[PDB]
Design a protein around this ligand. Structure first.
Ligand code: HEC
Ligand code: HEC
Lengths: 430, 125, 352, 55, 352, 55, 125
């Protein structure tokens, strides 16, 4: 199992499991959710300078690999290396987060980096519809609230950003109190904690970041109708459960019940999902996936989907929502059992991956909120505990007759009004 | 009624030499009395097809048996609408009166039976 | 009949059955494809449906991947239920029903999809055209089915008879108890299986250099080159690829992708220059070929090209090595060139 | 396309009395339906006309 | 502005306006196709409809046909109505309106049709490849529009300007009073046309040999070869063609087509072997190439090969000849090969 | 496909009173239509009931 | 009434200095009183499209103009259903109220008129 965490002057957390490489990186407890409408896309802008060609060559010669990640709740800068070169990493991490906090931001590099993410983001809004719709789902579900800020940042606030903004953010967020350095792969705990404690100092210690206003959900919808697109992508959700919630898993199990489906992959159509009977007769969609996005303040439970059957979208939604109704009144026992097995399975492949850069992002995010990583074995214990009765209570609070967030793009003329869809959140009774 | 059911009962009879020697004759006579062979039709052409199972079957049927069946059916309608019977030599000779669609039907039936069972399988911890 | 393992205190295990039946050894154009798509369908003792309903309740999934050299039958599951997934993979190899309707209703469709997707990505239309012209008829076999030459149900079956044999497949347990796997395999239908001859040759097969092919295409235009490697000269081409796929190269921004495909009898190196307008493609390729001809390296890629090749290597095979720290010098002899897209405003091999 | 086919009203007629696909082999027993239709008319008409004198 | 003619005591007359705007001179991939399909649309003074309606009442029709080198505007009518067709044809070259909608509602459709029809006959895909690999960008240009590179409504108008000029065109009235044709060609809008430089070079446009392309196509498999000629060598390649399509050649039944495409500066000799199964296609070309490698002739074809080139002469052009009752021996140097169809079951250039 | 849509009788009811696409901006003058429908019913129902007593 | 006829009569009033001065002022006034401008619509949007000529024109109307028209109309309904007008700075301005669809119509009518003539041309020998 493992997972060990110790303080010092800063807080360190590691997880070693003798495999191939080993990665070390600094994960900051602030991210997209800590930005503003006008400075939005600043973190995604740091991510690209840290991954700049200038800095990439410096670590490439030294035999390292750089990996950055920008999320809502957090931010991460990770360096991969061989098991032995575990010290080569820290000397680069520190070089770029202390020495080169004056370099890099030098023009000719910033302008190059900015022109590149400005295109990178313009490509995303023109092509990656599924993820764009999801981004807009957050945008409307949590509108005028922290969580509503898109990770890559807007295309406008991006071209208004100058070095100063980058610096201001770093000075306000990249701090000792709001940070966690992590190490996964095969590097031992005592090896890191000491190598870090070698070079003392603090660098803005005792400084706390500017707080804000708790994120909130709002029943709303955003429809980006584009008739020139060949499909209709849509995502829909309700207020979910935040990480470190009594129902963190109960909610995650409910999503696994309806799961994911790809109409073109033979095995997918054979799944044990009652909904798949209703959707395959007239092929209501090409694919769909259910999720249970959790964050520090709130979350989103619902599903995403793409469809070519533009004249029958109303049924896609109808059947899909009639199934969600079941979780409050008729979810069977074997539906819950199947979910557990498949939850455990997909949950395991998530934690137990052959890439430490994944493991890092998972260790950091957790210890950066609850201050400790929940062992995979401990999870299974909770998952197997969950009863049919549990799923129904959760559904009664979260799902039954509750507001919803809708977002769509492409040929969505057939997606009926908010009130029509909202109505399906329940069923008639005597 | 299912063919899985018909084929169950039927075979049991067809196996025990007591029921066999007693029924097969009645059955052969019942069939020659039915008169369908006289319209150039095989029994399987008579199976009502307005259901998922039969529809599944007919599609799975090899091209040639299908076109043939097509002809037989049309021929039957033309003859019936003329109120005659086909010239005696064109009658389906009992040896031709084969259950050609049947295997497909039974396959489809049991396939459905399973799907049905696996949809309601209980769990025991 | 090889059998490996690893074992760890993990919760997730993953059985694998690498069978040398990739496009490499396909008797007709696409049989490898169809057979792969045919796996996990009905077997005389298990319906495609039950396999799935069961494994879902058991916690575990099945997958079938097609390589240019393999037909991998991976199965991700919970560590303990090991015996099931062994018999499972067995039943598929020894008794897959191969019913005529499963072909028309499931295999053909899915295979058609795989090809429909691949047909729109000009780099995989370039990379396919490459193997076609370099290795000609060996690995030169098209990866996917497109029905240019008909493949009947029998063919998919005759071919399944050839490839699914003891002396042609290797069981590869990952995160499995060595003792128990070997134990379970030998009481499964993997031992009852016919043991025909292995279809792997240890020798380098025909290279053919200086070959060119142009493909008219609507969408993104792509210019690309391929280079066959030697059973040893490959270790350097791995750093060549990584050098160009890093900030160390003064031209890693002029290419879309750069890699070296490794095989037990050689390998192929490919570099692609993909872009919207034919001009940028023309510039960036005309440059790479002229810029590399005037060779370079010095190995700053070493110690890095052996980091990217450290994570990638987790699948029971860590050869190469040694030749690095050793060989560190490159130029550019002869190569193969395929231009896809706006062929008219894209260069030929004449210039470059 | 023909008028009887395109018109809102006439088309209902066309698809029930004119182009309606019948099995070539239906016999005279299938004629009972139209007869019941006629009875309804006769009954209805003769009736309304008598109502004009009934108490 | 060359004005030819003939005249005769007949009733039908056919007025043709040859303009060197064929696929060779094409500025963008297919503009020639589009401009040809654009001809006879709306003019600033006569809608397409009125031109037809009116012409019908007179007893005449129009047609715009695309060559690999010309864009011929033929107009068959009833002799006495000569003037109408002159001013009519003129009117087209000078003032076609090129409305944005005529392109979308008429031209592009008609073009995509033309291409899809062609796209299904492999002898024509083999022939398109033949020209493409022999004469790269000159005659190697795609004959029809396939949108590989976008051609705007402007590009058509530009190429229309380059091509529709006095120096670049030749009027040719078959069965027409020459005296009246010139009088009418003058005083018409033809003369008021610009006089941009003609686009014909007498020099041989590069050749390229030993080139081969392989195209995967579903259906009929076809193997073919093309050999570029000179301004004088084309004399023998013409007879070779008729010889290979006559009862005089033992192997005439082993090929489908054999012909020589003449030009004012060269030519391409094409030989196509089309069948069904790749086995009979291979055998039939492996022999054709084998036996022609063992040069043979004696030319018993002469005085027949000039009987076939006698009926095929009425389109106001008659070069060669003379080298008939002259050269009578043929070997087989180098050529270009294309294999369309069942690719993995057809010979390469290596063999043959 | 939903039932209200698939049934021979409910699909009619469905495409006329449930799924029928209306212009978002129609005002209350568009309410006169249904009012007339109601009127026809009031007249018919009241009439038949009164008819049981009329001579 | 045809636009061919409207423009025939309109241009004539416009082209004469006497009639021009006496009508146009009344015209601009009549237009302000109509009020479609306060609902964010150009008069051409108001033209009824349920007829072939208008369909032909709208089909022929370039993208930019179509998507905009689409917005204008959707916007108008939304405003109309709320029983408000748009904020004055959103009102379609005088030099914006341009007859964009008009030429496509005039051309479509022209084409139609001709076809009709050519479909009935009498011949005289
Ligand atoms: C038999 C069914 C019946 C139907 C159906 C019917 N009515 Fe009547 N109606 C009567 C009877 C009975 C009377 C006489 C009693 C009365 O005056 O209400 C009557 C009387 C009337 C009167 C006289 C007003 C008065 O002094 O009461 C009017 C007007 C009238 N009907 C209008 C209508 C209209 C309009 C409809 C249909 C839209 C209609 N009726 C349908 C039965 C019917
Ligand atoms: C003289 C004409 C006329 C008469 C009388 C008339 N209608 Fe209509 N009706 C119309 C027209 C025209 C429309 C379409 C108006 C629109 O929606 O723009 C219409 C529309 C309707 C509508 C849709 C709702 C609405 O008001 O737009 C209904 C329902 C309707 N009528 C019912 C009836 C019934 C029921 C009667 C009487 C028993 C009736 N109509 C009599 C002209 C009439």
């Amino acid at each position: 199992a493992e997972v060990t965490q110790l303080s010092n002057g800063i807080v360190v957390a590691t997880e070693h499991n003798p495999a191939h490489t080993a990665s070390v990186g600094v994960v900051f407890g602030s991210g997209a959710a800590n930005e503003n409408p006008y400075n939005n896309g600043v973190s995604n802008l740091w991510k690209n300078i840290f991954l700049s060609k200038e800095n990439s060559a410096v670590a490439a010669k030294e035999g390292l690999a750089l990996s950055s990640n920008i999320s809502r709740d957090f931010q991460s800068y990770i360096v991969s290396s061989l098991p032995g070169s575990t010290d080569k990493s820290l000397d680069f991490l520190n070089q770029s987060f202390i020495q080169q906090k004056a370099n890099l931001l030098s023009s000719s590099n910033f302008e190059a980096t900015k022109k590149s993410v400005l295109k990178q983001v313009q490509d995303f809004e023109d092509n990656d519809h599924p993820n764009r719709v999801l981004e807009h789902l957050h945008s409307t579900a949590f509108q005028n609230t922290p969580l509503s800020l898109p990770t890559r940042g807007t295309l406008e606030s991006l071209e208004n950003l100058v070095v100063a903004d980058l610096e201001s953010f770093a000075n306000n967020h990249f701090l000792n109190s709001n940070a966690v350095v992590v190490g996964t792969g095969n590097i031992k705990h005592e090896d890191l904690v000491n190598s870090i404690e070698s070079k003392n100092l603090s660098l803005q210690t005792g400084t706390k970041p500017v707080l804000k206003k708790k994120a909130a959900f709002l029943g709303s919808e955003v429809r980006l109708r584009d008739d020139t697109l060949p499909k209709a992508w849509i995502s829909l959700a309700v207020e979910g459960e935040p990480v470190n919630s009594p129902n963190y898993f109960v909610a995650k199990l409910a999503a696994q019940i309806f799961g994911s489906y790809n109409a073109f992959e033979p095995a997918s159509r054979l799944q044990g999902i009652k909904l798949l009977d209703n959707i395959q007769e007239y092929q209501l969609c090409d694919n769909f996936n259910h999720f249970s996005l959790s964050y520090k303040d709130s979350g989103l439970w619902g599903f995403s989907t793409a469809t070519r059957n533009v004249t029958m979208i109303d049924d896609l939604i109808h059947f899909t929502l009639k199934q969600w109704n079941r979780l409050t009144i008729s979810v069977t026992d074997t539906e819950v059992e199947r979910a557990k097995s498949l939850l455990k399975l997909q949950l395991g492949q998530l934690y137990e991956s052959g890439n430490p850069v994944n493991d890092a992002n998972l260790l950091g995010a957790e210890v950066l909120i609850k201050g400790s990583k929940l062992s995979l074995g401990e999870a299974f214990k909770k998952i197997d505990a969950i009863t049919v009765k549990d799923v129904k209570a959760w559904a009664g609070k979260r799902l039954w007759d509750q507001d919803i967030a809708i977002a769509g793009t492409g040929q969505i003329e057939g997606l009926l009004d908010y009130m029509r869809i909202r109505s399906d959140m329940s069923m008639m009774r005597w | 009624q299912s063919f899985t059911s018909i084929a169950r009962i039927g075979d049991y009879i067809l196996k025990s030499p007591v029921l066999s020697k007693l029924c097969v004759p009645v059955a052969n006579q019942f069939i020659n009395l039915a008169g369908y062979k006289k319209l150039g039709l095989k029994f399987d052409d008579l199976i009502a097809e307005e259901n998922p199972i039969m529809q599944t079957a007919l599609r799975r049927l090899p091209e040639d048996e299908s076109y043939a069946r097509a002809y037989r059916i049309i021929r039957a309608h033309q003859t019936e609408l003329t109120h005659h019977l086909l010239p005696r030599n064109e009658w389906i000779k009992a040896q031709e009166d084969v259950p050609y669609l049947l295997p497909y039907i039974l396959e489809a039936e049991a396939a459905a039976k399973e799907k049905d069972e696996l949809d309601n399988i209980e769990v025991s911890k | 009949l090889t059998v490996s393992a690893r074992d760890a205190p993990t919760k997730i295990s993953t059985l694998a059955v690498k069978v040398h039946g990739g496009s490499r050894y396909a008797t007709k154009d696409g049989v490898a494809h169809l057979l792969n798509r045919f796996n996990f369908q009905n077997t005389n003792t298990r319906s495609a449906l039950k396999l799935v309903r069961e494994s879902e309740l058991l916690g575990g999934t099945f997958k079938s991947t097609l390589d240019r050299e393999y037909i991998t039958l991976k199965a991700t599951f919970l560590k303990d239920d090991l015996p099931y997934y062994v018999n499972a993979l067995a039943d598929v190899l020894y008794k897959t029903a191969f019913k005529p309707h499963e072909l028309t209703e499931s295999v053909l469709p899915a295979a058609r999809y795989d090809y429909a997707v691949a047909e729109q990505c000009p780099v995989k239309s370039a990379e396919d055209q490459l193997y076609a012209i370099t290795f000609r008829k060996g690995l030169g076999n098209p990866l996917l089915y497109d029905g240019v030459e008909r493949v009947s149900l029998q063919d998919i079956k005759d071919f399944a008879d050839k490839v699914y044999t003891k002396e042609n497949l290797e069981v590869s347990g990952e995160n499995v108890v060595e003792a128990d796997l070997k134990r379970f395999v030998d009481e499964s239908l993997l031992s009852t299986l016919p043991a025909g001859k292995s279809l792997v040759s240890k020798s380098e097969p025909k290279f053919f250099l200086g070959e060119e092919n142009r493909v008219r295409f609507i969408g993104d235009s792509v210019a690309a080159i391929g280079i066959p490697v030697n059973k040893a000269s490959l270790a350097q081409y791995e750093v060549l690829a990584n050098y160009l796929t890093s900030a160390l190269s003064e031209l890693s921004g002029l290419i879309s992708s750069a890699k070296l495909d490794k095989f037990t009898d050689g390998g192929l190196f490919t570099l692609f220059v993909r872009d919207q307008d034919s001009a940028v493609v023309s510039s960036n390729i005309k440059k790479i070929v002229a810029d590399l001809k005037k060779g370079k390296d010095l190995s700053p890629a070493i110690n890095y090209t052996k980091l990217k090749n450290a994570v990638q290597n987790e699948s029971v095979s860590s050869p190469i090595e040694l030749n690095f720290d050793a060989v560190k010098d490159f130029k550019l002899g002869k190569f193969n060139y395929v231009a896809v897209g706006d062929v008219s405003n894209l260069p030929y091999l004449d210039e470059l | 396309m023909a008028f009887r086919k395109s018109n809102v009203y006439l088309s209902l007629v066309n698809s029930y009395i004119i182009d309606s696909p019948q099995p070539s082999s239906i016999n005279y027993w299938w004629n009972m339906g139209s007869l019941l239709g006629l009875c309804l008319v006769i009954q209805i008409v003769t009736g309304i006309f008598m109502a004009m004198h009934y108490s």
